[PDB]
């Protein structure tokens, strides 16, 4: 009976090595710790978010401190296209002379790392020009992290620790988060853009000792309150304006040209300030929707139980029974966590899908490796958030769901036909894999036997209609913003498409990624992607809806979320838990984003190298994906160190091979299972006891690690090997052809 772990008693009395491991993996499941009340649960959720916010701020201050200290922001900012950003310095005391010389790069006088995060472009756009501005930002974020470490400690003191009623005050939190956390913050950000970022992109230096005196507009503070709002967009930046200088600059601070800045190939800063200003007002308005304590507002609980639609008998919102859902969502933390992750998983996919097509930061479209890494980062982040959104759906069904409160509501109607949903995800998955693999390997066979004209090539004429419906005149659909005489193009009653000449100038220019040209090769991958999103939804939906149990074991709710099996009886129940559907869907999530990011990378690697006709003519069959993408672009990655030398890709060539090993060692935890290793550890335990001079002896008996743990240990290696291998590929295959 050890002290550790103190949160669970029955794991502290574990005599084996699984209690050190299970303590790590249970240490944050506060709702299952011994002697926990609901009141104490939230007060530890709350106080560990402060400890999390501080880590984000200490991480962010580490970005700033290291480019202030060891970066080349001053050198970079004078030529953001031809010099590489420095991440930090290298101190590996076991480099040879070949690695010092190779990694002494980008105008540095010491080994350094090339920043592929884009923070240089982000800071250059938001108005940071000196290293000292970066340093005081780093110091401020350290102290801002301090006031959240203190606040977290503060709200565990009994006199400051909030009560359960404060946490379950859903209407008051939504009102402030909409109005203040998002509304005021985006209003404040438009304040920075108007006061600092926009003026400093026109040359004038605005700082903390300067900003109180110089107004951002000549008509400041008076055109707003009179109502003469148009004064803020009188003369905008011209098309010959060059960034961070006064030549070509205007005076408009809130103007809505749309499209791209012709010199940075990014969105206009004045167009962003006007954006967050509009978003703020919409968000602040949205934050006055729910009544807090002023009996003017909405009550979410009553918006559920309402059954009267202007006197007409209805069953609830949208004529669907939502009664009891307020007390279901409000008391469930996993329902709330599932919704939050699902909404960050969309906001992070949406981040990736928009920041490549519509680059926000200056000169980021000309930094291909940064642009490529940022997409792959946020899509992989979004894939994990989507898996966790459906993980906590499965926890929600098991632990904090009851049929009594939710009797007859919209949530209980889903369980009534959970097999109709799963059977249909099964059909779509089967449909999309038979006719995408079958169409790829038909194209393989025809190209293999020379008859490349016998490929089945389906033009994606529906997405090409979208592009034509947004402005792309390339295809010739000639409708609806491709038709200059249409109702939508002109907006006949008002003609207020001030955004349209600038946008159509950008969408119809072929040198950007905004609405890329789409061909038959793009058709097939969007069905691989659709097949991917459907199977990994099928695995997760099956795991959430069968978390309560199915005919193979109808009592899964009693066994918890993560259990191995229910023995070999009834045929065998390996991987039966709802946890094993989250485990099984990480493979499909990684696979699917290994199709999204492979397709994003190869499509852009063909545009960037000018060989666009390589992707269009060879992405329709699977060998082209294998010869023209993987085999072709590995050449300079694997030659990062050869017998004849070593270059700046020697670390990417090493992590590429590192991730192959981390991937392969995953198969050990995934293929060979527990009882093999226990009979082998039982033998090594015999050898240690019987041998002389071995004076150590285990405090806790060595056992082969458990069933649900190896599935997690092997899933971590598969993931780390999936990310180190592709991270090294994507960085080295893009930052070797180019700068």
Subset of 675-714 contacting ligand F6C (CB under 6 A): 684, 687-688, 691, 694-696
SS (H, E, C) 525-583: HHHHHHHHHHHHHHHHHHHHHCCCCECCECCHHHHCCCCCCCCCCCCCCCCCCCHHHHH
Number of residues that bind another protein (CB under 8 A): 143
Q: How far is the CB of 685 from ligand F6C (least distance, A)?
A: 9
What is the number of the residue whose Cβ is closest to ligand CLA? 220
Residues 584-643 that bind ligand CLA (CB under 6 A): none
Q: Residue 569, interface with another protein (CB under 8 A)?
A: yes
Q: How far is CA 412 from CA 26, 134, 392, 397, 427, in A?
A: 30, 54, 17, 11, 24
Residue closer to ligand F6C, measured from CB, 461 or 684: 684
**Positive or negative torsion for Cα 88, 93, 99, 101:** positive
Nearer CB in complex with ligand CLA: 50/602: 50
Q: Does 693 bind another protein (CB under 8 A)?
A: no
Q: What's the rounded Cα separation, in Å, for the pair 531 and 535?
A: 6
Distance, CA of 480 to CA of 468 (rounded, Å): 7
Taking alpha carbons only, the member of 629, 673, 655, 674 closest to residue 723 is 655
Query: Is residue 726 close enough to count as binding ligand CLA by CB under 6 A?
Result: yes
Helices (H), 70-181: 73-76, 97-103, 119-126, 131-154, 164-167, 170-176
Angle between helix 38-69 and helix 131-154 axes, rounded to 10 deg: 160
CB-wise, 116 or 148, nearer to another protein? 148
Q: How far apart are CA 335 and CA 338, in angstroms?
A: 5
Non-local CB neighbours of 387 within 8 Å, separated by 6+ positions = 536, 540, 582, 585, 586, 589
Give the nearest distance from C-beta 240 to ligand CLA in angstroms.
25
Question: Considering only residues 262-301, where is the footprint of another protein by CB under 8 A?
Answer: none
Take residue 347 and report the two structure tokens written for it.
Answer: 């906001």
157 is a contact residue toward ligand F6C (CB under 6 A): no
Rank residues 173 and 674 by Cβ distance to ligand CLA and give the closer one: 173
Site for ligand CLA in 148-167 (CB under 6 A): 166-167
269 binds, among ligand F6C, another protein, ligand CLA, none (CB under 5 to 8 A by kind): none
Euclidean distance between CA atoms 327 and 641, whole angstroms: 61
Under a CB-based contact definition with an 8 Å cutoff, are residues 422 and 542 in contact?
Answer: yes
381 binds ligand CLA (CB under 6 A): yes
Q: How far is the CB of 53 from another protein (least distance, A)?
A: 11
Report, in Å, the least distance between residue 55 CB and another protein. 9
CB of 705 to ligand CLA, least distance (A): 13
From residue 476 to residue 515, what is the string marking binding to ligand CLA with x (rule CB under 6 A)?
----------------------------------------
User: Could you say which residues in the range 105-124 bind another protein, by CB under 8 A?
Assistant: 108-111
The residue sitting closest to ligand F6C, measured at its beta carbon, is: 696
Integer angstrom CA distances of residue 75 from 84, 112, 130, 397, 560: 9, 14, 10, 56, 57
Q: Minimum Å distance from CB 131 to another protein?
A: 5
Burial class (CB in 10 A: 0-12, 13-18, 19+), 375: buried
How many residues in the shown chain lie near ligand F6C by CB under 6 A? 7
The pair of three-digit structure tokens given for residue 512, joined into one six-digit string: 């950007």
Q: Is 730 in the site for ligand CLA (CB under 6 A)?
A: yes
Least distance to ligand F6C from the beta carbon of 713, Å? 14
Is residue 355 near another protein by the rule CB under 8 A? Answer: no
The answer to whether 441 contacts ligand CLA (rule: CB under 6 A) is no
- Candidate ranges 342-350, 353-361, 626-634, 649-657; the one touching another protein (CB under 8 A): 649-657
Task: Quote the crossing angle between the two packed helices 650-671 and 707-734, to the nearest 10°.
Answer: 160
As a whole number of angstroms, the distance between CA 647 and CA 734 comes to: 15
Determine contact, residues 276/186, Cβ cutoff 8 Å.
yes
Q: How far is the CB of 75 from ligand CLA (least distance, A)?
A: 19
* Shortest reach from residue 19's CB to another protein, in Å: 9
Q: Which of 140, 160, 667, 698 is the binder for ligand CLA (CB under 6 A)? A: 667
Pick what 205 binds: another protein, ligand CLA, ligand F6C, none; C-beta below 5 to 8 Å, kind-dependent: none
- Smallest distance from the beta carbon of 43 to another protein, in angstroms? 10
Determine if 398 is a binding residue for another protein (CB under 8 A).
Answer: yes
Q: How crowded is the C-beta side of 62, counted as CA atoms within 13 Å?
A: 7
**Residues 431-460 within binding reach of another protein (CB under 8 A):** 451-459
511 binds ligand F6C (CB under 6 A): no
* Of 254 and 518, CB closest to ligand CLA: 254
Which of 25, 59, 69, 239 is in the footprint of another protein by CB under 8 A?
Answer: 69
| DSSP string covering 331-400 | H-HHHHHHHHHHHHHHHHHHHHHHHHHS--STT-TT-HHHHHHHHHHHHHHHHHHHHHHHHHHHHHHHTS
Q: Is 558 in the site for another protein (CB under 8 A)?
A: yes
In whole angstroms, give the CA distance from residue 668 to residue 160: 50
Helix (H, G, I), strand (E, B) or coil at 679: helix
Between CA 642 and CA 309 the distance in angstroms is 74
Residue 695 CB, nearest distance to ligand F6C (Å)? Answer: 5
Residues composing the chain: 739
> Which of another protein, ligand CLA, ligand F6C, none has residue 98 at its interface (CB below 5 to 8 Å by kind)?
another protein
Q: At its nearest, how many Å lie between ligand CLA and the CB of residue 458?
A: 21
CA–CA separation, 684 vs 698, rounded Å?
Answer: 12
- Interface residue with ligand CLA, options 727, 733, 735, 736 (CB under 6 A): 727
Token pair for residue 610? 């000018």
* C-alpha–C-alpha distance, residues 508 and 475, integer Å: 11
Q: Residues 203, 297, 438, 645: which binds another protein (CB under 8 A)?
A: 645
Q: Which of 391, 443, 647, 733 binds ligand CLA (CB under 6 A)?
A: 391
**Among the listed residues 92, 124, 122, the one whose alpha carbon sits nearest the alpha carbon of residue 110:** 92
Q: Which is nearer to ligand F6C, 163 or 694 (CB)?
A: 694
Query: Bridge-partner residues for 707, per DSSP?
Result: none
**Which CB, 382 or 504, lies closer to ligand CLA?**
382
Name the nearest CA neighbour of 428 among 335, 534, 330: 534
- Would you say 152 and 272 are in contact if contact means Cβ atoms under 8 Å apart? no
694 binds, options another protein, ligand F6C, ligand CLA, none, Cβ within 5 to 8 A by partner type: ligand F6C
**By CB under 8 A, which span of 364-372, 386-394, 477-485, 595-603 interacts with another protein?**
477-485
- DSSP β-ladder status, 645-646 and 86-89: unpaired
* Closest distance to ligand F6C from the beta carbon of 20 (Å): 12
Closer CB to ligand CLA, 100 or 448, in the complex: 100
Binding site for ligand F6C (CB under 6 A): 684, 687-688, 691, 694-696
């Amino acid at each position: 009976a050890t002290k550790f772990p103190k949160f669970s008693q029955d794991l502290a009395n574990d005599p084996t090595t699984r209690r050190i491991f299970y303590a790590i993996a249970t240490a944050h499941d506060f709702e299952s710790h011994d002697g926990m009340t609901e009141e104490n649960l939230y007060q530890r959720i709350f106080a560990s978010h402060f400890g999390h916010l501080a880590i984000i701020f200490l991480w962010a201050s580490g970005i700033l401190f290291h480019v202030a200290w060891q970066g080349n922001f001053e050198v970079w900012i004078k030529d953001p296209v031809h010099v590489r950003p420095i991440a930090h310095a290298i101190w590996d005391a076991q480099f040879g002379p070949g690695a010092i010389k190779a990694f002494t790069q980008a105008g540095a006088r010491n080994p350094v790392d090339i920043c592929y995060s884009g923070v240089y472009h982000w800071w250059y756009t938001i108005g940071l020009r000196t290293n000292t501005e970066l340093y005081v930002g780093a110091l401020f974020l350290i102290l801002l992290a301090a006031v959240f470490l203190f606040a977290g400690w503060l709200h565990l003191q009994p006199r400051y620790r909030p009560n359960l009623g404060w946490f379950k005050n859903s209407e008051a939190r939504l009102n402030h988060h909409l109005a203040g956390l998002f509304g005021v913050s985006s209003l404040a950000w438009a304040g920075h853009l108007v006061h600092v970022a926009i003026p400093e992109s026109r040359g004038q230096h605005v700082g903390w000792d300067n900003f109180l005196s110089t107004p951002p507009h000549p008509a400041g503070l008076w055109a707003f309150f009179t109502g003469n709002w148009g004064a803020y967009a009188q003369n905008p930046d011209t098309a010959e304006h060059v960034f961070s200088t006064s030549q070509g600059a205007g005076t408009a601070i809130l103007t809505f040209l749309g499209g791209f800045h012709p010199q940075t190939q990014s969105l206009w800063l004045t167009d962003m300030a006007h954006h967050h200003l509009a978003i703020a007002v919409v968000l602040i308005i949205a934050g006055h929707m729910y009544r807090t304590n002023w009996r003017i507002g909405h009550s979410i609980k009553e918006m559920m139980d309402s059954k009267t639609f202007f006197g007409r008998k209805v069953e609830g919102p949208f004529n669907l029974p939502h009664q009891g859902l307020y007390e279901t969502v409000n008391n469930s933390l996993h329902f709330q966590l599932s919704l939050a992750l699902a909404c960050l998983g969309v906001a992070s996919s949406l981040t990736a899908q928009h920041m490549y097509s519509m680059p926000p930061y200056a000169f980021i479209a000309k930094d291909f490796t940064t642009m490529a890494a940022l997409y792959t980062h946020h899509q992989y982040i979004a894939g994990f958030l989507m898996v966790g959104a459906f993980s906590h759906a499965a926890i929600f069904w098991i632990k904090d769901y009851d049929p009594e409160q939710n009797k007859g509501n919209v949530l209980e109607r889903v369980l009534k036909h959970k097999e109709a949903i799963i059977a249909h995800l099964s059909w779509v998955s089967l449909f999309l894999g038979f006719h995408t693999l079958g169409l790829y390997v038909h194209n393989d066979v025809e190209v293999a036997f020379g008859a490349a004209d016998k490929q089945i090539l389906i033009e994606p004429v529906f997405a090409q209609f979208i592009q034509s419906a947004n402005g792309k005149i390339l295809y010739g659909f000639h409708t609806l913003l491709s038709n200059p005489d249409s109702i939508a193009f002109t907006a006949w009653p008002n003609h207020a498409n001030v955004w349209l000449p600038g946008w159509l100038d950008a969408i119809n220019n072929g040198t950007n990624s905004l609405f890329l040209t789409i061909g038959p090769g793009d058709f097939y991958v969007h069905h691989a992607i659709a097949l991917g999103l459907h199977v990994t939804t099928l695995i997760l939906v099956k795991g959430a809806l069968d978390a309560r149990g199915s005919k193979l074991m109808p009592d899964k709710k009693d066994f918890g979320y993560a259990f191995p099996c229910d023995g070999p009886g009834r045929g065998g129940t390996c991987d039966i838990s709802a946890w094993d559907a989250s485990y099984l869907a990480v493979f499909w999530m990684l696979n699917t984003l290994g199709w999204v990011t492979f397709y994003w990378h190869w499509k852009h690697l063909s545009i960037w190298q000018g060989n666009v006709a390589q992707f269009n003519e060879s992405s329709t069959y699977l060998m082209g994906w294998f010869r023209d993408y993987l085999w072709a672009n590995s050449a300079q990655l694997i030659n990062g160190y050869n017998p004849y030398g070593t270059n700046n890709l020697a670390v990417w060539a090493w992590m590429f091979l590192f991730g192959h090993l981390a991937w392969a060692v995953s198969f050990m935890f995934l293929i060979t299972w527990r009882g093999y290793w226990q009979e082998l550890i039982e033998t090594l335990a015999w050898a240690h006891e019987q041998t002389p001079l071995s004076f150590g002896y285990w405090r806790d008996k060595p056992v082969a690690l458990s069933i649900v743990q190896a599935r997690l240990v092997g899933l971590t290696h598969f993931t780390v090997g999936y990310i180190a291998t592709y991270g090294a590929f994507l960085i080295a295959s893009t930052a070797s052809k180019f700068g």
